[PDB]
């Protein structure tokens, strides 16, 4: 039952939507929209944010042919809630908030929260707080916790409504302190499903193999994809066009992706120069 999000309307994450954006070329856009609908995403991400331009500029020029050229639920991902506020007038009914989270402390956490009970929107809620980025398993749970009860006891939402984001981080580039980022995530949130019943769990996916060859990339994320549904993954913030069946990935490059994300080094063995070396030799 994984509700996919298209990722590819991101400013940040996507050259091709950048360029059109920038171009203001509108058709590009609403055909790149459902082009991502008819690969499988139930919904798609938006963010236009980017350095210099007014946010609700491009906000104010892309929602109202959005709007209307589908019917898809928008995830509109902004740090801004005045950007959701614009994007929930032009979509009631059909809106997920990217996201609540603590960054900036209670109040600007408590302005997403209640936009999202008084819209009847999903809220995604990303570990993130005060002290920065859950990184540890142990801050993942620490963080989501708290964050749970604020969004439970106080707003009046309730489990279902919410997507806890645990943090997907690139484990590749080989650094001591990043290799284990996944293995924390995965592990957080099974812990989290057995505290927390009935809240969903989503993750930004392709993220966990940036840096990456193409190939490396559709294979990692689509193991981590699946590893993370086993764990509880209700929804997943994906290129739904580019995720390939576990049947579909020969049993090396499957196996090699496993050794990779659960950070199985050994002595004579690195599993993230063996997962590049796979391909490349293939």
Do not use: C
Request: charged content about 30%; hydrophobic content about 45%.
């Amino acid at each position: 039952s994984l509700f996919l999000v298209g990722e590819r309307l991101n400013a940040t994450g996507s050259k091709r939507f950048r360029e059109m954006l920038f171009a203001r070329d509108l058709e590009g856009i609403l055909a790149l929209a459902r082009e991502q609908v008819e690969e499988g995403a139930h919904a798609l991400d938006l963010s236009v944010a980017w350095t210099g331009r007014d946010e609700l500029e491009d906000l104010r020029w892309l929602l109202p042919h959005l709007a209307t050229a589908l019917t898809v639920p928008v995830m509109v991902d902004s740090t801004s809630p005045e950007a959701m506020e614009l994007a929930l007038k032009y979509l009631p009914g059909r809106v997920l908030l990217n996201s609540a989270n603590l960054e900036d402390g209670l109040e600007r956490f408590d302005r997403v929260a209640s936009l999202a009970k008084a819209h009847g929107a999903a809220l995604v809620v990303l570990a993130i707080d005060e002290k920065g980025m859950a990184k540890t398993r142990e801050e993942k749970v620490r963080v989501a916790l708290r964050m749970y009860e604020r969004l439970t006891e106080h707003h009046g939402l309730r489990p279902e409504d919410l997507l806890f984001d645990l943090l997907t981080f690139p484990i590749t580039q080989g650094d001591e302190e990043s290799r284990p980022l996944a293995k924390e995530t995965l592990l957080a949130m099974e812990e989290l499903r057995e505290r927390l019943p009935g809240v969903g769990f989503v993750l930004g996916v392709s993220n966990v193999s940036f840096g990456l060859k193409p190939r490396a990339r559709r294979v990692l994320n689509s193991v981590f994809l699946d590893e993370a549904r086993k764990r509880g993954l209700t929804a997943a913030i994906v290129d739904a066009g580019k995720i390939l069946p576990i049947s579909q990935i020969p049993e090396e490059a499957y196996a090699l992706a496993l050794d990779l994300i659960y950070d199985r080094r050994k002595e004579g063995f690195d599993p993230l120069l063996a997962f590049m070396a796979y391909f490349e030799a293939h």
